[PDB]
Design a protein around this ligand. Structure first.
Ligand SMILES: *[C@@H]1O[C@H](CO)[C@@H](O[C@@H]2O[C@H](CO)[C@@H](O[C@@H]3O[C@H](CO)[C@@H](O)[C@H](O[C@H]4O[C@H](CO)[C@@H](O)[C@H](O)[C@@H]4O)[C@@H]3O)[C@H](O)[C@H]2NC(C)=O)[C@H](O)[C@H]1NC(C)=O
Ligand SMILES: *[C@@H]1O[C@H](CO[C@@H]2O[C@@H](C)[C@@H](O)[C@@H](O)[C@@H]2O)[C@@H](O[C@@H]2O[C@H](CO)[C@@H](O[C@@H]3O[C@H](CO)[C@@H](O)[C@H](O)[C@@H]3O)[C@H](O)[C@H]2NC(C)=O)[C@H](O)[C@H]1NC(C)=O
Ligand SMILES: *[C@@H]1O[C@H](CO[C@@H]2O[C@@H](C)[C@@H](O)[C@@H](O)[C@@H]2O)[C@@H](O[C@@H]2O[C@H](CO)[C@@H](O)[C@H](O)[C@H]2NC(C)=O)[C@H](O)[C@H]1NC(C)=O
Ligand SMILES: *[C@@H]1O[C@H](CO[C@@H]2O[C@@H](C)[C@@H](O)[C@@H](O)[C@@H]2O)[C@@H](O[C@@H]2O[C@H](CO)[C@@H](O)[C@H](O)[C@H]2NC(C)=O)[C@H](O)[C@H]1NC(C)=O
Ligand SMILES: *[C@@H]1O[C@H](CO[C@@H]2O[C@@H](C)[C@@H](O)[C@@H](O)[C@@H]2O)[C@@H](O[C@@H]2O[C@H](CO)[C@@H](O)[C@H](O)[C@H]2NC(C)=O)[C@H](O)[C@H]1NC(C)=O
Ligand SMILES: *[C@@H]1O[C@H](CO)[C@@H](O[C@@H]2O[C@H](CO)[C@@H](O)[C@H](O)[C@H]2NC(C)=O)[C@H](O)[C@H]1NC(C)=O
Ligand SMILES: *[C@@H]1O[C@H](CO)[C@@H](O[C@@H]2O[C@H](CO)[C@@H](O)[C@H](O)[C@H]2NC(C)=O)[C@H](O)[C@H]1NC(C)=O
Ligand SMILES: *[C@@H]1O[C@H](CO)[C@@H](O[C@@H]2O[C@H](CO)[C@@H](O)[C@H](O)[C@H]2NC(C)=O)[C@H](O)[C@H]1NC(C)=O
Ligand SMILES: *[C@@H]1O[C@H](CO)[C@@H](O)[C@H](O)[C@H]1NC(C)=O
Lengths: 480, 180
């Protein structure tokens, strides 16, 4: 019969109507029997009391002259209308057209494990909001929490200023009365402080090929047309001749980027957007070595991402066990052709864990390979063949083959081609070394005849042959 | 990389000396640029993507203001000094318009080739022009202004500003190369 309220679950704000028969503001005590015999003073018919023990209690109210009122009060008459929480800050990103909202969970003032829920609510300039969405939030007793909400602008890019709001509702399994909805926070306003001349948003953005993206236009002059690459779109008034269009679904711009332009009677305000494919899992990946100084990795780009320079993918090759690594970035666009990346290796080593990571401001892609270097030795082509006489029937055939080959040994071939005969091919092995000339004794020849030599090399563990040499071509020799 | 380049600090003190004839070189050189012009402008706007060729006058309007004056008559000196500025002016900005296209349209070798030669020849006309503006004229140093693009910011604008500049160039060379 004595209707109550509370902001937190600590103190009851209880008011009763006066006992009719001219007794007005002649109020002395209001007494409660709970914990102890406590008695509170009065100025008028309502008062601020400490929340008591669940159950029924004798609440008597004394009036000055004679009377006194006898009131049965509980926990389940009381309603819990929480305080208005205030928005602490409203830092806003402009690059990404997005909002951050941070407030004080006054959890310091609300007892024990208690699930409480928030109706946040945004808005721009139209008669209603973009978003009004609700957060689950369980509350930690005692410790105030500093909880966030990271929302992002569906539509424009802050060219049109936003308001935000938040009401919260507490529950408690250790409270009994009508768990009630609080009320709306005093609204919070964020705004553009015009940075540049520019009047159309957003500039220079890169987006996923075929992306339902929205773009807007701050204008002085009633805007007549809005179009991406001659396909004008039906444009929609936002507020002050400042207007916006939807790019339905976007085809991947070329190198120069797709242009979206607006025209008013007077001037022309416009914007470039780049439409992209993230890089594709790089393809036919296989590394080898022609020298034993450095490893090289062949690979194919894949689907070409349609983008250029800064945006063109940046392939990075990473030897794990080494730590050593290198980088690829071509300004011109990529092909169906295959490119190679020139990584160093510390002497010998062997075990090799390769990670090729193509990055491009939209997504990542990565394939790996694992290589026993000394199993990939597939050397350059041998050069500068000199031939030196020993006897009539024998010659010293020698060349120079680039590469650290001191650990390994190579076996080479000698196409001793003589005139008008079958190709005599010889298979002899030699000990290799540091960027060095190699020497072969060649025998069982014919004195004074039309010889021609070819050399062709690989490691005795062999990956693949050298190319075929050049042409040595020499005669033989006599006695007298 | 291909390097265009137009000198600002020109001086009868420091400049590169020249061959013979002079006037009839800068006549030839002048009206030569006039040739390329159209096609190089075509080429520019062409690859700036749609809808650039269909709004050719609203976007690539022969317009960019603050532009170095030219007067029709007056003594060789006037014509020559005046020209000199215009030259300084384009080649300054013209370099930039390239250093742009160098990363926006790095595929049209077709465009660079032009852009690049239209700088080379432009540089010549310069030394050749002052080379006369120094032999029986003695100004000492033509005082000058620098072209557009401090930033320019937006890709977009950088296209318009280049589409506009090229527009006037096209519009201006056609006078220049007739007058003297
Ligand atoms: C990269 O690959 C290379 C080339 O295969 C590899 O170097 C090779 O290592 C193996 C062992 O890992 C060597 O083979 C051995 O040679 C000697 C004989 O001189 C023996 O110790 C071994 O015999 C035993 O193991 C055999 C296994 O097949 C058995 O058949 C045999 O009964 C024995 O139990 C074995 O034959 C080989 O000599 C080298 N290759 C050369 C010539 O250098 C290397 O391990 C790989 N990368 C690295 C550096 O780990
Ligand atoms: C040209 O020389 C070759 C051999 O070349 C040999 O090796 C060089 C690197 C030099 O050090 C030379 O001094 C040396 O000759 C001659 O053919 C070779 O002849 C020798 C002598 O007969 C052979 O050695 C013989 O081996 C047999 C056993 O097989 C013994 O019974 C002998 O005692 C003798 O030592 C050698 O095997 C043979 N080499 C080949 C590839 O057949 C070649 O006769 C000579 N010709 C000319 C024009 O002088
Ligand atoms: C914490 O509370 C949520 C939601 O509480 C509701 O919102 C209040 C304002 C009021 O409407 C109450 O009646 C609701 O309980 C609980 O999630 C709900 O659970 C119910 C029942 O399963 C379900 O039908 C709803 O769809 C849920 N809504 C949401 C927002 O999730 C949630 O179970 C509570 N969490 C804990 C830890 O107890
Ligand atoms: C990409 O956008 C299309 C179209 O979006 C609709 O039209 C816009 C002007 C805007 O008002 C949006 O809110 C609209 O939804 C989406 O295609 C529509 O998808 C819905 C739900 O699947 C469907 O009911 C409609 O029939 C679709 N319209 C047409 C003509 O296809 C599409 O789903 C979006 N893609 C995504 C997932 O981003
Ligand atoms: C990329 O090329 C491959 C290989 O084809 C050859 O080499 C190319 C680099 C190119 O220069 C071609 O002219 C050469 O013919 C193409 O491989 C084909 O792939 C399709 C689909 O997987 C398959 O049906 C064919 O059999 C392949 N062709 C043959 C016979 O090798 C591939 O199509 C190219 N990829 C792209 C993205 O276009
Ligand atoms: C809200 O969250 C988003 C993404 O979770 C944040 O955007 C990221 O910001 C960092 C720092 O520069 C970068 O990794 C990217 O720019 C963003 N990543 C995403 C999500 O794409 C954003 O900063 C948050 N909002 C605020 C105001 O801090
Ligand atoms: C934040 O700005 C908004 C709007 O600019 C203010 O609330 C609106 O103010 C306009 C103009 O004063 C009124 O006509 C409307 O009644 C308000 N609109 C809404 C959505 O209620 C608000 O007063 C400002 N608040 C702060 C904290 O600065
Ligand atoms: C060429 O390769 C050889 C090894 O294949 C290098 O010689 C080795 O040097 C290291 C020093 O770290 C020693 O541990 C080894 O004992 C050496 N011997 C070999 C052959 O393994 C040589 O330094 C390499 N040359 C260069 C500098 O590339
Ligand atoms: C190679 O390194 C990668 C690191 O991502 C790891 O996944 C893998 O286990 C390693 N394997 C070998 C062969 O060392």
């Amino acid at each position: 019969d004595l209707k109550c309220t509370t902001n937190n679950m600590r103190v009851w704000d209880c008011t009763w109507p006066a006992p009719l028969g001219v007794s007005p503001g002649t109020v002395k005590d209001i007494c409660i029997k709970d914990r102890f015999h406590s008695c509170h003073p009065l100025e008028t018919t309502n008062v601020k009391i400490p929340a008591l023990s669940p159950g029924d209690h004798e609440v008597t109210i004394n009036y000055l002259n004679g009377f006194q009122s006898k009131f049965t009060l509980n926990e389940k008459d009381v309603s819990l209308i929480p305080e208005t929480p205030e928005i602490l800050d409203l830092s806003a990103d402009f690059f990404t057209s997005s909002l951050l909202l941070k407030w004080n969970d006054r959890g310091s003032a609300l007892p024990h494990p208690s699930n409480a829920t928030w109706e946040i609510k945004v808005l721009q300039n139209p008669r209603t909001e973009p978003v009004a969405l609700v957060l689950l939030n369980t509350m930690l007793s005692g410790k105030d929490t500093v909880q966030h909400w990271n929302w992002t602008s569906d539509l424009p890019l802050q060219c049109a200023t936003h308001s935000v709001s938040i009401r919260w509702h507490i529950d408690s399994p250790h409270f009994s009365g009508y768990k009630e909805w609080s009320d709306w926070s005093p609204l919070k306003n964020i705004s553009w402080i015009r940075n540049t001349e520019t009047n159309v948003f957003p500039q220079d953005k890169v987006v996923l090929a075929g992306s339902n993206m929205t773009i807007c236009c701050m204008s002085p002059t009633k805007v007549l047309s809005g179009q991406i690459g001659n396909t004008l779109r039906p444009l929609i008034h936002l507020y002050g001749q400042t207007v916006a269009i939807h790019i339905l679904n976007i085809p991947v711009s070329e190198n120069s980027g797709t242009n979206i332009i607006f025209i008013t009677d007077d001037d022309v305000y416009g914007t470039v957007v780049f439409a992209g494919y993230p890089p594709d899992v790089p393809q036919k990946l296989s590394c080898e070595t022609h020298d034993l100084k450095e490893i090289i990795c062949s690979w194919n780009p894949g689907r070409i991402t349609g983008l250029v320079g800064p945006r063109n993918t940046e392939y990075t090759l990473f030897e794990s066990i080494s730590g050593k690594s290198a980088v690829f970035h071509r300004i011109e666009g990529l092909t169906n052709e295959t490119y190679r990346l020139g990584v160093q290796m510390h002497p010998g080593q062997e075990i090799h864990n390769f990670t090729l990571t193509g990055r491009n401001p939209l997504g990542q892609a990565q394939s790996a390979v694992v290589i026993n270097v000394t199993e990939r030795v597939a050397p350059h082509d041998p050069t500068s063949l000199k031939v030196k006489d020993i006897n009539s029937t024998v010659v010293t055939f020698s060349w120079y083959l680039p590469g650290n080959f001191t650990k390994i040994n190579l076996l080479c071939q000698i196409e001793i081609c003589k005139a008008n005969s079958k190709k005599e091919v010889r298979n002899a092995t030699i000990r290799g070394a540091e960027d060095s000339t190699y020497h072969v004794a060649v025998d069982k020849l014919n004195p004074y005849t039309a010889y021609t030599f070819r050399v062709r090399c690989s490691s005795k563990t062999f990956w693949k042959w050298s190319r075929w040499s050049d042409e040595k071509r020499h005669l033989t020799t006599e006695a007298t | 990389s291909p390097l265009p380049i137009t000198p600002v600090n020109a001086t009868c003190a420091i400049r590169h000396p020249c061959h013979n004839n002079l006037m009839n070189q800068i006549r030839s050189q002048l009206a030569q640029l006039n040739g390329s012009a159209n096609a190089l402008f075509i080429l520019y706007y062409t690859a700036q993507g749609e809808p650039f060729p269909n709004n050719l006058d609203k976007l690539c309007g022969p317009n960019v203001t603050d532009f170095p004056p030219f007067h029709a008559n007056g003594t060789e000196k006037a014509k020559l000094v005046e020209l000199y500025r215009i030259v300084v002016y384009l080649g300054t900005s013209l370099g930039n318009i390239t250093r742009d296209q160098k990363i926006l349209n790095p595929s049209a070798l077709s465009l660079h080739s032009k852009l690049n030669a239209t700088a080379d020849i432009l540089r010549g006309l310069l030394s050749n022009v002052l080379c006369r503006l120094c032999s029986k004229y003695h100004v000492g140093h033509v005082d000058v202004t620098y072209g557009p693009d401090t930033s320019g910011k937006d890709v977009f604008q950088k296209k318009k500003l280049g589409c506009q500049l090229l527009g006037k160039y096209k519009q201006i060379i056609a006078v220049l190369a007739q007058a003297f």
